[PDB]
Amino acid sequence: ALWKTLLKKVLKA
């Protein structure tokens, strides 16, 4: 619900 785009590579950022 809009999270995979939060750790797209920034390891949760």
Ligand SMILES: *C(=O)CCCCCCCCCCCN
């Ligand atoms: C999409 O969101 C799939 C995984 C769930 C992550 C969100 C947790 C719910 C609590 C509020 C934080 C913002 N969605």
